[PDB]
Every structure is written in structure tokens, then in C-alpha cells.
């Protein structure tokens, strides 16, 4: 199926106590492969996957150079926004940045994205065609105006359409054993009675990759949405994921309820009933 | 890999 390369950056100012806490991480699909942290001793982009270790010190001088430029960018951005919003140096504020590529089933360009937020709130981002910016704020449209004159978007589009794809294609081939692996959910089901006259059926999905999964409950043919308790999909720590979904039911009618599990790494969708 | 010419505000 489809694949992605996403980079995530977070800067957080500190009132006195030096310069901002900068944290950068890069993913391919749902797998982190690099990080930089300004409080780590290394002061370098660090590998976090087996297959990126194959690159030499010229790739790493390069990431270190560019990730250092991202952190310096966010430091002056912070300072600039504090000015535009009329805010104190006493305060502690946050900028976040996210960009990347998608490709289709053939490793070819599908979509590009680039988004920036201040405090928790959208500030400015590329539209989906990649030639223009959404900026809702009054400060945001001054930023828009400077970046239109300086052809900021056209330069980004060159990376997102071009070299971002070229490098995702490199990492996919290089990492093929881990990144084009699909891992089947080990599914099981629990039942503890909630009350007299009623009981919880909980449907579990363990040890799966990637994290995209659908878990719904059916009753006879119909689906419970109002009634299902989902939880957000969570990492196991080993680079697989977990999810469950739960529904409460009248006691003695468990046979009426089936859990539909849909995932990429299963031949056909599974359906579990509560075996007595 | 990671964009070079990332722009300030």
C-alpha cells in the first residue's frame, strides 16, 4: 500500500534558563528512524532504526547541519511571535512544525504537506496544491506576504515533490525487511459481568503493524457506534501496536454479538463471537 | 531526508 515520510519538530521557550528545548523526530510509516534533542550530549542527529545506520558521516554531517538550522529558525520565530502577539519574555511559548510526503502503491508522489503552529494553534500552512498558504490570523497574513515575495513555497514544493520522494524510496528499499512488513493482530476477547442482568464484552487486538486497524462490534447484522467504547491505539514498546473495543450487552445474548477486525496483514477480515 | 532552506517568519 501507501507510505509516508514525516518529520516532526517541537521548540519550547524557557523564561531565563537558556535557549529553547528543541526536539526533532523523523518517521517512515509508523517507524521512527531519527531524532535530535537539544539536551542530549551527542549534539547530532541520531539514528533510531537498524537500516539508517547504513549511511556514512556525510549523510550525518548533513542532517546535523540542517536540523541545527531548523532549531535556530524556531528560536527566532519564537522571538518574532512574542513581538507580533505582544507577549512577555517571562512567558514560555511553543512552536511546532510538521512536513512530509506520501506515495502510492508504486513508490510515486501522492501528497505533500507543511504545517506550523504557535502555542497549540494553527499559524500558517501550505494548501494541498502546495503553491499558496492558509493563514487565518492577522500576524499570519504578514508572514504569508513576506513568503510569497521570497518564493518560499516554490522551494518547498521542490523538496516535497522531489527529494522527499527520492529519499523515502531509498529508505523503503534499504529498510525493506522492517518497513514492508505487515504483522497480524493476535486477537482475543474478554467477558466480565458488569451487573446482574448485564456484561462487558471486550475485543482485543495485540501485536500488529502498522497501526491502522478497524475494530467494530456487530449485533446480528447491525453495528454499535453509540454503544462501543474504543481506546486510542497504543504502542507496545516493541514497535507493534494495541487496541481494544468494548460493548456492554444484556446477559445471555453474547452469541448475538460479533467483533469485526479489519487490518492490512490479515488475508480476510476476522469475526469473533464469544465462544461460551 | 530533511529540508535545507527552511524559512523564518
Amino acid at each position, epitope marked *: 500500500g501507501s507510505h509516508s515520510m514525516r518529520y516532526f519538530f517541537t521548540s519550547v521557550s524557557r523564561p531565563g534558563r537558556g535557549e529553547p528545548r528543541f526536539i526533532a523526530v523523523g518517521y517512515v510509516d509508523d517507524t521512527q528512524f531519527v531524532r535530535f534533542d537539544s539536551d542530549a550530549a551527542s549534539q547530532r542527529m541520531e539514528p533510531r532504526a537498524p537500516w539508517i545506520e547504513q549511511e556514512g558521516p*556525510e549523510y550525518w554531517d*548533513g542532517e546535523t*547541519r*540542517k536540523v*541545527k*538550522a531548523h532549531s*535556530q*529558525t524556531h528560536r*527566532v520565530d519564537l522571538g518574532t511571535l512574542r513581538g507580533y502577539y505582544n507577549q512577555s519574555e517571562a512567558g514560555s511559548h511553543t512552536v511546532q512544525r510538521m512536513y512530509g510526503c506520501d506515495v502510492g502503491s508504486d513508490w510515486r508522489f501522492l501528497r505533500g504537506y507543511h504545517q506550523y503552529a504557535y502555542d497549540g494553534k494553527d499559524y500558517i500552512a501550505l494548501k494541498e496544491d502546495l503553491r499558496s498558504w492558509t493563514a487565518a490570523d492577522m500576524a499570519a497574513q504578514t508572514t504569508k506576504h*513576506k*513568503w510569497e515575495a*521570497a*518564493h*518560499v513555497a*516554490e*522551494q518547498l*514544493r*521542490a*523538496y516535497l515533490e*522531489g*527529494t522527499c520522494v*527520492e529519499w523515502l524510496r531509498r529508505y523503503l528499499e534499504n529498510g525493506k525487511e522492517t518497513l514492508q512488513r505487515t504483522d497480524a493482530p493476535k486477537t482475543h476477547m474478554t467477558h466480565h459481568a458488569v451487573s446482574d442482568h448485564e456484561a462487558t464484552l471486550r475485543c482485543w487486538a495485540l501485536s500488529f503493524y502498522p497501526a491502522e486497524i478497524t475494530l467494530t462490534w456487530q449485533r446480528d447484522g447491525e453495528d454499535q457506534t453509540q454503544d462501543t467504547e474504543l481506546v486510542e491505539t497504543r504502542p507496545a514498546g516493541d514497535g507493534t501496536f494495541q487496541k481494544w473495543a468494548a460493548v456492554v450487552v444484556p446477559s445471555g445474548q453474547e452469541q448475538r454479538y460479533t467483533c469485526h477486525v479489519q487490518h492490512e496483514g490479515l488475508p480476510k477480515p476476522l469475526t469473533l463471537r464469544w465462544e461460551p | *531526508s530533511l*529540508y*535545507n*532552506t527552511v*524559512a*523564518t517568519l
Partner: T-cell receptor
Amino acid sequence: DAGVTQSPTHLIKTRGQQVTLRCSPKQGHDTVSWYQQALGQGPQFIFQYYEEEERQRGNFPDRFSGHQFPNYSSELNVNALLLGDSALYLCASSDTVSYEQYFGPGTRLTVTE
Amino acid sequence: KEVEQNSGPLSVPEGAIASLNCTYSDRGSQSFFWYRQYSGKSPELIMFIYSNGDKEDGRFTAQLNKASQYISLLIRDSKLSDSATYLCAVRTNSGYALNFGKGTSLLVTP
């Protein structure tokens, strides 16, 4: 509130001496890169400074070194001058929005026996 | 040797289209610039090109092709003040340095 500026415009040195060229970017720009241009040839990247630290190095040897100050101006120091160090030493200034680079006049170095 | 140009001279009669090529070899080259250098002077940016394809600007047209790794520059309606050395230049996605060609020199025959 001017353009890129360099000094001195011209220099004359004997082999083995040392030299220190000055450059200051266009107001509103804060990155400076230094290149070397032999006659008839293309400019060769030496290094680039941002925020007073060296941001990237070219493939020149140790005797070439640089600084950038708080006001963003920069010095290029070269020692153990060699005849073949004769060149146009150019300074290019750039902001961090668009990253286009604009050249100064240059310092024109002659190194003579 | 990372970015390549013939030195010339290249001669073009006044009023006629001039054409200059430049080829490069790093596949990660992402950004392209033409600069112009008059005898005795510094280089001046005449055109940047950031996307594959053609870009017109007044008398100047750049043609970029990354599959084949060349950039052309054509100059329409050549004047005597176009006589100059044209330097081709690329910035790769690795970094912020420009890699420059040897420079091709144009004389406009009046």
C-alpha cells in the same frame, strides 16, 4: 542601510605572510559565505557563517579560518600565503527566508615572490 | 567537476539568440542559479530556477531538466552589454553552499 561591502578592495602580499579580509552583509541579511575565484574559473566555496558559528565548510585547508561577529559582519583569515592563493575572494550575503546569495565586490589578492 | 560548463568564447551576433548550457552530476541538486560577471567585477544573480521546466524573464529564459541533468539559459535579442561571463550554479539539498561552473564567456559581435 547599504548593500554587501568588503575591504580591502585590493591587496599585495609575499609568500608566507598572513591576511585578514573583511566583509559585511546587506542590512537585513545575517548569513555570509566566502568563496574563492581564480581567473577564468568559477567561485569555490570556503565556508558559511550564521549566528556567529561556522555553519558549513568547503574543502579548503586548515590555514583558511573565519569568524562572524554579533553584528553579522565576517572576517576571513588566511596564513602561510602561497602564490596560488592569488584570487578574488568574494563574500556573499543571504537571509534565511529565501536563501538567495548576493555577492559583494571582492577583495583582490595578489601574492608575489 | 561537480557542475560543468564550456569556457567558450561563445560568439553571437547582435540581435540574435544566444544559448548557454551547463550540466551537473549530483542527483540531489535541488536549486539552480545563473549569475553574470562582467570583466573586473563580481557575479550578479540574473535568474533563479527552483522547479523543473522552463522559466521566462524578460529577454532571459532558463530551461531545467533534472532527469537529464542540464540547465540551459537562452538570451533573446542580444545586446553588446550582454557580453560577460555566465556562471551556472547549484545548491544541493545537503547544505547551503553553491557549487559553481567554470563560467561560459559570451562575446556579442556588433
